[PDB]
Amino acid sequence: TAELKICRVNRNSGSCLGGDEIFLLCDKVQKEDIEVYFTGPGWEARGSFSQADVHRQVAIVFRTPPYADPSLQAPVRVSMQLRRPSDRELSEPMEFQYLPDTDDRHRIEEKRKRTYETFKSIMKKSPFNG
């Protein structure tokens, strides 16, 4: 009866779009028989990595899976644990929080609206015509 155990993580939150690289220090694992299992109400996903990303079967580097909802408007806390597909064994749940995305294109767009009037004024009051 082996036991999965997450000892340490370098971060407990990331973008809802997924893609954040996490360093997970755990107990001895089998590189070909292991995964990072993210769960929430009616939703489950796996972190992405290859067996080449398991360091001495005692640490794992993967990228968070994207959250069920991309246009998340508020932080949503989910569970993150080690899962051994072999016998379906799981580790003590650890908390992981997804946050509204930090996209740059949108970051600019939301900023475009938010400043339409202010811009219409600066160029209005400027020596420029048009």
Binding site: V54, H55, Q57, R107, I122, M123, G130
Partner: protein
């Protein structure tokens, strides 16, 4: 002399709203001055915003007006860095050549190996975003195809295998990327490939060097 609550000057907002007329106006006399290089709170310049938007015309106007191209935003990203993650090929083109100047160069080259705070140079980004087109562009511009990224010494070829980008891997291979390089741990591009689900990658490498790897099963703990 104006700044938004987010540090954006008229120039910043001209590009955000996309006002070619006003942008043209601004650059009227602000050209050749450090006004162009001002950074909002995200450490971005107008050029930065222009890159992100993928507006090649805008990028040229700023560049032609003397906009500093090596300025870094909060992520250490240069305009060009931004273009590689947005697939703004044409913006890259505008920048990857001598600055505009009518009949009134190593400098534009300095952009080629500038690196962000992730230890990535434009090429690293291009290859990670499996942007084959950006790779051809940077390759032709003369970017270091072997340059290792610092977290573990991964080369473009290593990144191309991690992205499972075959066309990219091959492009890099035909361009001359060394398939012999290994990351801090000793792993080589071929070695990583074997631990991946895409067989094409290993074959490609096999066909350009194929130095078969070692093993040492991750040297267990």
């Amino acid at each position: 002399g104006y700044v938004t609550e987010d540090g954006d000057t008229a120039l910043h907002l001209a590009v955000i709203h996309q006002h070619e007329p006003f942008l043209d106006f601004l650059l009227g006399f602000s050209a050749g001055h450090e006004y162009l290089d001002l950074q909002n709170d995200l450490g971005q310049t107008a050029l930065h915003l222009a890159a992100i938007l993928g507006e090649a015309s805008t990028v040229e106007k700023l560049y032609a007006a003397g906009a500093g191209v090596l300025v870094a935003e909060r992520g250490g990203h240069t305009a060009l860095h931004l273009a590689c993650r947005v697939r703004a090929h044409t913006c890259a083109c505008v920048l990857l050549q001598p600055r505009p100047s009518h009949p009134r160069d190593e400098d534009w080259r300095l952009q080629l190996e500038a690196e962000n705070y992730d230890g990535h140079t434009p090429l690293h980004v291009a290859v990670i975003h499996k942007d084959a087109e950006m790779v051809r562009l940077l390759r032709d511009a003369g970017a270091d195809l072997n340059k290792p990224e610092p977290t573990c010494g991964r080369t473009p070829l290593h990144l191309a295998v991690e992205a499972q980008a075959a066309s990219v891997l091959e492009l890099l291979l035909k361009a001359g990327a060394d398939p012999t390089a290994r990351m801090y741990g000793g792993r080589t591009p071929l070695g990583s490939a074997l631990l991946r689900p895409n067989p094409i990658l290993a074959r490609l490498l096999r066909a350009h060097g194929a130095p078969e790897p070692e093993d040492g099963g991750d040297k267990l703990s």
